[PDB]
Design a protein around this nucleic acid. Structure first.
Lengths: 163, 119
RNA sequence: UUCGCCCAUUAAAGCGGUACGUGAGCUGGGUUCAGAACGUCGUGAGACAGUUCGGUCCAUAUCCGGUGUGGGCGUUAGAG
RNA sequence: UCGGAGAGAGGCUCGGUGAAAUAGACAUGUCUGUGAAGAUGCGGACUACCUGCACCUGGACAGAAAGACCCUAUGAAGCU
RNA sequence: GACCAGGCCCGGGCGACUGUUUACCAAAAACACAGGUCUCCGCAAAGUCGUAAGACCAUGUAUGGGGGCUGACGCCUGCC
RNA sequence: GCUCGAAAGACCUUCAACAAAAGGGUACCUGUACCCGAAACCGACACAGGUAGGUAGGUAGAGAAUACCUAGGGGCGCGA
RNA sequence: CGGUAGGGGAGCGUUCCGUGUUAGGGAGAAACGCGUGCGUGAGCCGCGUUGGACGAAGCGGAAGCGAGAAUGUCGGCUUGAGUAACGCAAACAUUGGUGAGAAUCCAAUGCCCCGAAAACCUAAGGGUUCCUCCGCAAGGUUCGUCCACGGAGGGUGAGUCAGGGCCUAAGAUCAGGCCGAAAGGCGUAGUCGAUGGACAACAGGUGAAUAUUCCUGUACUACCCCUUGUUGGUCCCGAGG
RNA sequence: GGCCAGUGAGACGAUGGGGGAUAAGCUUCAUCGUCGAGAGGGAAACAGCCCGGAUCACCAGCUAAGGCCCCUAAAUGACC
RNA sequence: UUCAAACGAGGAAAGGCUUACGGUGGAUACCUAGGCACCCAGAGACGAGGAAGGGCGUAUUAAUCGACGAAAUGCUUCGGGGAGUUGAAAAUAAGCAGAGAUCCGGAGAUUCCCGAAUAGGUCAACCUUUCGAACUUCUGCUGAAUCCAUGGGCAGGCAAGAGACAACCUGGCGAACUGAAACAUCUUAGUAGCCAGAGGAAAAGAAAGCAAAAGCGAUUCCCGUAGUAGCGGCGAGCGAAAUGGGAGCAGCCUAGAGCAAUACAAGCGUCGUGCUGCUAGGCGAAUCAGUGGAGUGCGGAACCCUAGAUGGUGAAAGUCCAGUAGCCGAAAGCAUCACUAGCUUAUGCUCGAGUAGCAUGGGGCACGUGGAAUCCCGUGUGAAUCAGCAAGGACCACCUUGCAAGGCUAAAUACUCCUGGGUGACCGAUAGCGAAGUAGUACCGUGAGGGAAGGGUGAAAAGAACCCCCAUCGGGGAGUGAAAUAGAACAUGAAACCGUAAGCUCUCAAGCAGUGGGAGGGGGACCAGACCCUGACCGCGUGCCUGUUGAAGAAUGAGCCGGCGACUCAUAGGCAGUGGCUUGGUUAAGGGAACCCACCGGAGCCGUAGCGA
């Protein structure tokens, strides 16, 4: 959105040079030089929308390594579907107090326990992302080394990333 | 196009040229241009004096002995002198080792009698 | 107009270079600035190394180089 | 033609106020020769204490003017 | 007798003259001027302004007016 | 504006007109300071440039010429 | 393994963003020096001082990615400079007053210039620059207790002057209407617009600044109403003027 | 064969020939080399002539061209 | 101690270099209730019951602005809500107030003069009569030229004529530069620009279409089909359609009587009700003690949390404050959807009716007439008319389809002055809109029109009493503050430029003057060990860049410094590197309970068999 001056010389005013002949001053006009202040601009960023078009099979197999390199180490494991019930958040702080890492080692908290809706209680916390178990990109997954799932979300991950 | 703002960037590209310029007589050390035409000189001449430094002495050594030849007896040339050692077998006493003339002229006096015996 | 011719002298009354010396000095009279007119050329606009009338060309200059005159210092003990 | 003198407004000195054209950088002498061939800065050589003021004013193809001359670019603007 | 206060004459080119004009370099034998002649219109004119209406030209009217060249007067203005 | 006449239509013992006290009342709204061939105007400035009209004395003289004097207004704003 | 234009092969740094409210910082960024160690290089790292806030290691991603010249653009600052100039040649000085200081302010004695003028009055324009009490850095190409400089107050009081107000020329606009692609043009009744025309007083005095307006003495014109006398009056007029 | 270029007014010396007087660093072709996109050493100073054609450091030697009285290193060395 | 000769430091008017300390000036780093873009959701209108835009005034002195308007920075009424109120740049003076003194929002009153303005006129904000423009539609009253009839005129009730309208949209008229490497065809633009009207959507729209003998079947918009075919000094250049996949997606009126305007529906209103939004508003959680000028910092510990978005408070908290999630509220005044109502038009069934071409000369369809129609026209004419006619890119026959000559019609589709929230690897006051501090002002020109400079001391200013010098300008101290080597030129404050002090060099020496060798001197060394800073003298030695076969110059550009300033972006195509898949690979629009641009969509394009007109 770095909208600049497209039509340089075409600003609030116009090009109105002076008698350019036998004077001494640079042969040029004023305003929208644009070299001179209060003028337009030659080159400059335009309303861009860089959005590369990606395939499908190139993404499915590109997101499989995400959970693969995760389950390989000793990161957070799955949980249960009864996690969607708890409408409060305090019940979570006490929960994350058992699995470990209470003071939050860092932004390592890629949460994806729910499926249908979002955990309005797990979004409050500073470091933690509530991603829906469907389009798990390589970004967020590796964004937080620690990631927690459930017995349900793990199933949906087999529908797309699988057969 | 609103650049990334040179600011201090273009500030270091000139002062660095000034630090080098801190021993010049003229005002070639208080202006990027006055020094621009100055550094190039110390940029070319430097590439010369480095190779000239060897030649600069090539004439010196010979001149050092030359001033020492006009007193002994071999008013001919120091070439015959070098020829003596050459025909002899002395890979020593080089143009640089010719410093035996000024200091301890007693050692350089020996070779004077050794060059005649050979040739 | 340089030159040249003519009248009158001088001992003789020179040539040439110096961007045909010299306009960051004058003159700028002639001549490629705009006007106008005659002859000639083109149908014409105009044109012509043909002619004619009139027709604003600035500047307190640092340095180099000069005409002159001083301020200091060095010739060593300091001066006349 | 040989001009001179004198009276005024500047110029010169001091006090107060207080510009500019221009300029890559300077410790920017002459001369011969040389050099894309009439440069102080190349080479040789000669000459020459450092630094101002006033004045005369040739050099730095000085300054102002990407010349109105010619040509080039199947440019432009009027006219016949 | 201060201030104030035409220089005159002779010959010759051209334009009759006064006047006007390239406002900021040319004001001149340039231009203009009256005089003469050719040509168009009896007309709501020709003709000019305007796509139009309208209107100027004349609420006059061919000793009118409009356009072109010439252009005081004197002697004249040929052939094709 | 003023004066006079108006098929004396409308008015028609009326309303009005002229004159007399050249009574009484009223005459609302604005500008009108200063300068104005002047440095406060027009030209970038306190640039001797340019700019309409009116009043305008004594003496010499034809003269709002000219020179010297009135009233009056200044010495022009860097000096020695 | 010299190298231009060019082609090809490798990187640094700057702003921002993802990985970062992890970590470094008030026991402290930024601006300057130094260690002149380090890399092929542009630079990097550490640190002193000053200084005041955040900035940002590594890889990658996205860049309006770093110019001493395009008679560049904007701003500031040198040089010729402290040379010229200080702007018609109608010279100036002195004795005093006030002030820190004044040849040029004020006051007094004169010189000198103009004298149909560098007098006054008035229109246009300007427009408060007029007057008084103070102050002065800036504006006055000298200073200034001076000024048409700045900062506060005060001051233009006419029915007869002038402009509105009646009328009107060039000319503009202009109902209905005539015309023109739209717009609009032209044009009449009518209606505007002047340097045009139409009723009416001045001479003195007074105030720091105005005055034919304040004051004094003496007058004038028009309209409405009223009183008296006489008489017939009367439109956007005809006619005379 | 494929992707991206750049450059089409080059100059000079030797040699072989047209133009000019076999006059020009002049002009127009062919060939080689250099400059032009490579310094340096030497011809005093002259890019294009000659030698040699520069990754770098080094108070390291030997040579090419050109020289060896001094000025800037090097034979007023020997014989005719 | 005397005479000569050979040498000789020491000396500077001034200057150069290094270093230290300042001034001028101003950049950079950092931070900004503001711009630059965009998304979602609304609003798309005001107005003679008089507006936009301004002048003149108004508050307690009170010039300038923000409002309002001589009931003049305020009044009346209802409500929310909660206390302070007299707007701002400057306090003060004098007060009103603790259940309507202000403020915020809605509904009204008032609202001079000037500007459509509509009284006439007018150098607008002035003048003079006076309650009156001029027109369109309708009614009544009068009424010419000739008996009527009109014309014309008068009066009254509405509307229309104004915003000198930001873009989008329809219509009328209508270029050039430039491209065609020349240029009159052509293209470039039927754009820009001028003008008229209306809506907030317009326009168009249910089809004498297309295709075809299979069938689809309103218009518009998006992605493809081809940027092929076709058109063209077939040169430049422009550029179809059929068909397919989607968004969206409803079809109805007008064109002789009898009984007779009862039923069923569509389009609206004087007003009102309900849902859902807009214009005020309320409820809305959580800890201390220690270092430092201060902490929201760090270390220990605890708590809230569908609210750790964000900002502020003397430096980074979610737990201080305002908010934020969520949950509620609006006497009323309104938009968009529904449900009911005055009046006019509109309405059912049945049985009918059903609105006329071309030649020539033009324009528009991709199509500049060419074989190339058709559609809309200026002019002269001008048939048939549903056992009839048109279209199928010449014409003709057959077949098929469709039947216009009058009109209306939501949504998908376009854009924006302006409103509320939010977003942005957008910038940050030589940036960005010219305008983030009372600039499109001050200024320039007659005018149209053109068009700046100038940012922040600190948290709060306690922004400096008094004392000393001076003309009671200015400074230095005393104090305040963590800082004024922060104080109104003020933050961090470099460079160009301008000086002082200190060491060295510097009058018999010259040429863009540095460099290599290199003595001495002023300092710093190590309990020699010969080094770190200045530099006499000496060998060489004619800036850079551009343009050129070739220059150092008399080849040209440049006064210096800071900032600023030139191959970026969109689409498409052809290659190279690399990655997934593979003779297969891959989507565009669109849909989407989407922490998310996945999934679906493969309509379409490319390739493996080619070649030939």
């Amino acid at each position: 959105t770095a909208s600049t001056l497209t039509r340089a010389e075409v600003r609030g005013g116009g090009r109105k040079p002076y008698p350019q002949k036998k004077t001494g001053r640079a042969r040029r006009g004023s305003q929208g030089s644009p070299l001179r202040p209060g003028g337009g601009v030659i080159f400059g960023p335009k309303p861009r929308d860089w959005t590369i078009k990606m395939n499908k099979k190139e993404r499915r197999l590109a997101l499989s390594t995400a959970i693969a390199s995760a389950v390989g180490n000793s990161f957070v494991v799955e949980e249960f579907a009864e996690n969607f019930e708890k409408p409060k958040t305090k019940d979570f702080i006490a929960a994350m107090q058992r699995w470990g890492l209470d003071p939050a080692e860092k932004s390592l908290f890629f949460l994806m326990d729910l499926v249908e809706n979002v955990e309005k209680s797990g979004r409050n916390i500073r470091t933690l992302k509530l991603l829906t178990p469907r389009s798990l990109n390589l970004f967020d997954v590796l964004n937080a080394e620690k990631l927690v799932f459930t017995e349900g979300t793990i199933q949906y991950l087999n529908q797309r990333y699988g057969v | 196009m609103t650049r990334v703002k040179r600011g201090y960037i273009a500030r270091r590209r000139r002062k660095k040229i000034r630090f080098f310029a801190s021993s010049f007589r003229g005002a070639h050390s208080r202006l990027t241009r006055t020094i621009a035409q100055q550094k190039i000189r110390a940029l070319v001449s430097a590439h010369r004096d480095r190779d000239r430094q060897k030649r600069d002495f090539r004439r010196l050594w010979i001149t050092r002995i030359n001033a020492a030849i006009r007193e002994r007896g071999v008013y001919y040339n120091y070439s015959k002198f070098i020829h003596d050692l050459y025909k002899r077998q002395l890979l020593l006493n080089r143009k640089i080792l010719a410093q035996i003339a000024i200091l301890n002229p007693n050692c350089i006096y020996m070779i004077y009698n050794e060059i005649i015996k050979k040739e």
